[PDB]
Structure 1
Amino acid sequence: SRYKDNRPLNILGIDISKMELGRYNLFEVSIFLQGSYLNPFDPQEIDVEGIFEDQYGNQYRVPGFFYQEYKRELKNDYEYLVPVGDPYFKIRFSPINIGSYKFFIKVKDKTGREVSSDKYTIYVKESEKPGYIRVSEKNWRYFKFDNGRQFLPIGANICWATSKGTYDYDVWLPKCAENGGNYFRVWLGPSWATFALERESVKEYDLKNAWKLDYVLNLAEKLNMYIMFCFDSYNELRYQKEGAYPYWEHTPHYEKNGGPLKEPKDFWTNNEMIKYYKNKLRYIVARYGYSTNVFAWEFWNQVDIISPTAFVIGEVKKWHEDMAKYLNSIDPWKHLITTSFAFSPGKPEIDSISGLNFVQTHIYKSNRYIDALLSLIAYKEKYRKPHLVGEFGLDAGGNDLWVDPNGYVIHNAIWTTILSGASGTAMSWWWDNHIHPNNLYFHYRALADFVKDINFLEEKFERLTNYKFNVYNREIKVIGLQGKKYILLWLYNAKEAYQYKKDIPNMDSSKFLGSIELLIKPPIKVIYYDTYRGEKIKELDLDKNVIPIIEFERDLAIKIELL
């Protein structure tokens, strides 16, 4: 209990970040206090709350959180955080309406003593921010912002840094954002993760790693990127003898390391563990819930491959139902909630629960993965909520970087997923050893420039059918969407798309290859798009439903407008 206090409860000072701010912007309160508590991360020991009210009756109860300031520096090849001042408490709020808000602070500690502040008034003006990310009410396959604009996630996993810490995100995130990226995913566990909150303990959270997460969230704010926060990863509950990067013997949950659990199976039902997990969810909501740049709360990375001694489907299901209900109830902004599985088809008993707002697929597969992605996307339409292919790679034991240095595998996956009805791109692994050093960001820029001017929420897209190839001496296949105004095609050569040795294609041809006939009514405008250079190649006005295919090396995109 390094942070314990044993003084009578009193507010000593309050700092306010600004009295005028924009819609959805951060309003931060710093609270200096003394009190009686053993653990500032436990609301039964000390409970800080900010009570906000707008002009329209809406009240918000925002939990406060323990905070330490740091100053970062680079010590050769590793980040070092120097503490600045004593720790204190913060409240982080974001206004959804404009106009006036009144608020005050309430604090209660374990003695039952309660103190409060006077009421303060702030004023909120309109801003450029689109709001929080929600499921689209127009098309349940897709996400939107509160203001109605679509959110199509384009990006990759960027789940932890090297020893350089936040200084790696200083490099990766601007490169991603300038190439059309608006999404990434970070890990808040296991204990070795850059942003691990449960580093030494499951009862107290790591203030340095939480500060790094602040920093990276602030960088995403500046770059208009949106983050999935993955709270826990399967390794935490997987025994050393089971392989696959296990970590149970080292995890703070284990009694050997000071935690409440004698075995990982007890995670789902141990009363002490459940209480501390809820405290962690409260801490996460308190410290990060304000942010519209939090796209989603994700409970688990691949919960199905925890130890088989620990995976009890009914208990994992009930835990997800209960925690999703608790998290939603304490989150004033009601962020999206999800979870993930390593098994590519997922677990319908869990994917079907209403408290998970969208489903995911992880798939690592080397052979015919285009067909596998299409099949999984078609299959999971049964859930009637968005589908994110949250992890994708070859099944090559991490050897994607030597097998495919040009990123053709990533290329194939992002085009296939977006044009098959998934909510956004397939999200690659290997951000640090592959995407960045091989400079693969251009693939995302080409795709983003192709899709960004289409409102997917309103096209009523469905997977392409009713088509007829007429192509000789070549095997061309199609992934496509047919909408009320647009038809989007990705054509690929089946004999070239899975070969990765050749250099990046340089500029297709002037020649006719073949044709594809579509069940559509002319006239139409046809745009041919180079998926590697990310540019229009050719435009063609047509009076019939037979679309010529120009010569191309590996793959080609076509945008068709119904006139």
Structure 2
Amino acid sequence: SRYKDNRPLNILGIDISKMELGRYNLFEVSIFLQGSYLNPFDPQEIDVEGIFEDQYGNQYRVPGFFYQEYKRELKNDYEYLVPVGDPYFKIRFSPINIGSYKFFIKVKDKTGREVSSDKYTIYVKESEKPGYIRVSEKNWRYFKFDNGRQFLPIGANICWATSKGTYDYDVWLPKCAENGGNYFRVWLGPSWATFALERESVKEYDLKNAWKLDYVLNLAEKLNMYIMFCFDSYNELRYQKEGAYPYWEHTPHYEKNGGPLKEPKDFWTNNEMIKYYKNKLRYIVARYGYSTNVFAWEFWNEVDIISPTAFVIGEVKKWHEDMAKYLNSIDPWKHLITTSFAFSPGKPEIDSISGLNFVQTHIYKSNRYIDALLSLIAYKEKYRKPHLVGEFGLDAGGNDLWVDPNGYVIHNAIWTTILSGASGTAMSWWWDNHIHPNNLYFHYRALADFVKDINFLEEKFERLTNYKFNVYNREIKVIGLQGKKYILLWLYNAKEAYQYKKDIPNMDSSKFLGSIELLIKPPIKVIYYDTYRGEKIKELDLDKNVIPIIEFERDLAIKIELLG
């Protein structure tokens, strides 16, 4: 309770960021107040709210949150944050409709006293922003923005920084975005994470780390990138004796460290922990919910590998059901909600929860991972909601960095996942020690440029099924999608695709190798696409349904337009 107050409840002053702003832009109110509370992060101690109403009958009840300003510097080789001024409270709002809004501020503290402001009027004009990300109503395999444009996530995990903190995101994110990236994932736990809110306590949240997350969210806003926020990771609830980077002994949840829990099993049902967790969800909604650059709220990283002493399937299921209902109810903008598993097929009792809007896969597999991805994507179509391969690599142990410096594994996975029908790319690990130093972003640029003009929401793509290969003395395989106006093929050499010691293909020749016959109606236009240089190699107008395959080293993309 370092931030306690014991004065009669009064609003002292307010600052309004701007009285006119654009659709989906941030409207920020800053509030100085005094009152009686032991913990500004607990709504039973102090409850700040903004009540906003448009001219179309919609009301928004926006929780407010405690804030400390900082000034950042790169002091030697680490980020250093200097506090500026006293902490105070904020309300962060984003308008969905344009036009006029009225709003007022309401505050209640532990004494039961309530105070309110007068009503203020603001004006919202049209903007370029596409809105929040939702599941597509036209094709449940994919995401959309509110404005109807597709959101096809292309990117990687970028879940924490080095000691350089936000200065690492200053480097990684512009490089990702200039190479077709629009997506990343960050971690808000365990307590060592860059953006850890529960750093020293589960009752009070870390204002420095929350400020870093502000900064990175603002950078995503400037770069048109969209972020999955992962609230907790399994390490928090895994005992030392169980390995796999366990952190229970160090986590603030444990009674040894000041928390309410005697053991991780009690996380799911302890009333005090549930209350604190709901307070955390309220803080996250208050501080970040306004942002259309929040793609999704993710409760857990790999909740199935918490301690086996703590995983009770019915309790974990009920907790996800109840927390998804609570989060949705307090989030004025109704962001997407998900969770994840280490077990690649996931847990159907949890994945089928209606309140989880999409499902995920994590998979680290060294052999025949192309087939594994295809199989998992086919399997999870049973849920009739989008599927994000949210973690991918060869080996949780990092063998990738030594065996595949050119990123062929990432390359194979991102092409496989997009052309197998998943909602976006397989999302690599190793952002800091592999993707960036090896400059692997070109793989994403080539894929992004291949799919950029295809509307997955309209094509009614199905996996390619009726094809005949005529290829002699080479074992070529195909992953493909057949749609209303396009067929998209990724062809790979089953031998070479899993061999990583070779230099990046430099395609010079374009000899004839073989053919693929497809069930289509001429005429058609065939585009051959170099998946490494990210460019068209050759274009062929065809009057029959036999598509030549030109020579390639490792893999080749083909885009076929149904003209007839």
Could you say whether these structures have the same fold, taking a TM-score greater than 0.5 normalized by the shorter chain as the test? yes
Alignment partners' CA distance in 2, 1:172 and 1:283: 27
Residue 32 of structure 1 and its aligned partner are, at CA, apart by 0.3
Alignment partners' CA distance in 2, 1:445 and 1:418: 14
Cα distance change, pair 212–429 in 1 and its aligned pair in 2 (3 A):
same
Aligned to 1:209: 209
User: SS of the counterpart of 1:507?
Assistant: coil
Aligned to 1:412: 412
Alignment partners' CA distance in 2, 1:518 and 1:370: 22
Quick one: percent identity of the two aligned structures?
Answer: 100
Residue 396 of structure 1 and its aligned partner are, at CA, apart by 5.8
Residue 519 of structure 1 and its aligned partner are, at CA, apart by 1.2
Alignment partners' CA distance in 2, 1:325 and 1:519: 46
Contact 1:508 1:552 in 2 (8 A): no
Residue 373 of structure 1 and its aligned partner are, at CA, apart by 0.2
Alignment partners' CA distance in 2, 1:285 and 1:519: 50
Contact 1:16 1:28 in 2 (8 A): yes
Comparing 501-510 with 283-292, greater Cα deviation is found at: 501-510
Any unmatched runs of 5+ in structure 2? none
Alignment partners' CA distance in 2, 1:560 and 1:138: 23
Alignment partners' CA distance in 1, 2:43 and 2:417: 43
Alignment partners' CA distance in 2, 1:280 and 1:445: 37
Alignment of 1:21-420 (within 5 A): 21-395=21-395, 397-420=397-420
Residue 372 of structure 1 and its aligned partner are, at CA, apart by 0.2
Comparing 219-228 with 544-553, greater Cα deviation is found at: 544-553
| Per-residue Cα deviation, 1:475-506 (whole angstroms, up to 9, x for no partner) | 00001100000000000000100000000000
Residue 75 of structure 1 and its aligned partner are, at CA, apart by 1.0
User: SS of the counterpart of 2:497?
Assistant: coil
Cα distance change, pair 508–337 in 1 and its aligned pair in 2 (3 A):
farther
Any unmatched runs of 5+ in structure 1? none
User: SS of the counterpart of 1:458?
Assistant: helix
Aligned to 1:5: 5
Contact 1:508 1:551 in 2 (8 A): no
Alignment partners' CA distance in 2, 1:548 and 1:374: 25
Alignment partners' CA distance in 2, 1:245 and 1:389: 22
Cα distance change, pair 166–493 in 1 and its aligned pair in 2 (3 A):
same
User: SS of the counterpart of 2:412?
Assistant: helix
Contact 1:366 1:396 in 2 (8 A): no
Contact 1:132 1:145 in 2 (8 A): yes
Alignment partners' CA distance in 2, 1:467 and 1:264: 52
Alignment partners' CA distance in 2, 1:236 and 1:452: 39
Query: Runs (4+) of structure 1 moved beyond 2 Å?
Result: none
User: SS of the counterpart of 1:457?
Assistant: helix
Alignment partners' CA distance in 2, 1:212 and 1:510: 50
Residue 438 of structure 1 and its aligned partner are, at CA, apart by 0.1
Residue 103 of structure 1 and its aligned partner are, at CA, apart by 0.2
User: SS of the counterpart of 2:321?
Assistant: helix
| Per-residue Cα deviation, 1:220-260 (whole angstroms, up to 9, x for no partner) | 00000000000000000000110001000000000000000
Alignment partners' CA distance in 2, 1:235 and 1:516: 48
Structure 2-normalised TM-score?
A: 1.00
Residue 507 of structure 1 and its aligned partner are, at CA, apart by 1.4
Cα distance change, pair 35–396 in 1 and its aligned pair in 2 (3 A):
closer
| Per-residue Cα deviation, 1:428-470 (whole angstroms, up to 9, x for no partner) | 0000000000000000000000001000000000111001111
Residue 86 of structure 1 and its aligned partner are, at CA, apart by 0.2
User: SS of the counterpart of 1:350?
Assistant: helix
Alignment partners' CA distance in 2, 1:240 and 1:398: 21
Contact 1:175 1:441 in 2 (8 A): yes
Residue 399 of structure 1 and its aligned partner are, at CA, apart by 1.7
Alignment partners' CA distance in 1, 2:332 and 2:364: 36
User: SS of the counterpart of 2:323?
Assistant: helix
Residue 173 of structure 1 and its aligned partner are, at CA, apart by 0.1
Comparing 418-427 with 518-527, greater Cα deviation is found at: 518-527
Residue 350 of structure 1 and its aligned partner are, at CA, apart by 0.3
| Per-residue Cα deviation, 1:392-447 (whole angstroms, up to 9, x for no partner) | 00026112111000000000000000000000000000000000000000000000
Cα distance change, pair 562–199 in 1 and its aligned pair in 2 (3 A):
same
| Per-residue Cα deviation, 1:303-355 (whole angstroms, up to 9, x for no partner) | 00000000000000000000000000000000000000000000000000000
Residue 537 of structure 1 and its aligned partner are, at CA, apart by 0.2
Contact 1:30 1:90 in 2 (8 A): yes
Alignment partners' CA distance in 2, 1:396 and 1:135: 30
Comparing 501-510 with 414-423, greater Cα deviation is found at: 501-510
Alignment partners' CA distance in 2, 1:97 and 1:501: 54
| Per-residue Cα deviation, 1:197-242 (whole angstroms, up to 9, x for no partner) | 0000000000000000000000000000000000000000000110
Alignment partners' CA distance in 1, 2:214 and 2:82: 16
Alignment partners' CA distance in 2, 1:9 and 1:251: 35
| Per-residue Cα deviation, 1:271-297 (whole angstroms, up to 9, x for no partner) | 000000000000000000000000000
Contact 1:363 1:391 in 2 (8 A): yes
Contact 1:77 1:163 in 2 (8 A): yes
Alignment partners' CA distance in 1, 2:463 and 2:452: 19
Cα distance change, pair 31–297 in 1 and its aligned pair in 2 (3 A):
same
Contact 1:508 1:553 in 2 (8 A): no
Alignment partners' CA distance in 1, 2:152 and 2:327: 25
Residue 510 of structure 1 and its aligned partner are, at CA, apart by 2.0
Residue 508 of structure 1 and its aligned partner are, at CA, apart by 5.0
Aligned length: 563
Cα distance change, pair 102–396 in 1 and its aligned pair in 2 (3 A):
closer
User: SS of the counterpart of 2:355?
Assistant: coil
| Per-residue Cα deviation, 1:24-60 (whole angstroms, up to 9, x for no partner) | 0000000000000000000000000000000001000
Residue 509 of structure 1 and its aligned partner are, at CA, apart by 2.1
Structure 1-normalised TM-score?
A: 1.00
| Per-residue Cα deviation, 1:157-180 (whole angstroms, up to 9, x for no partner) | 000000000000000000000000
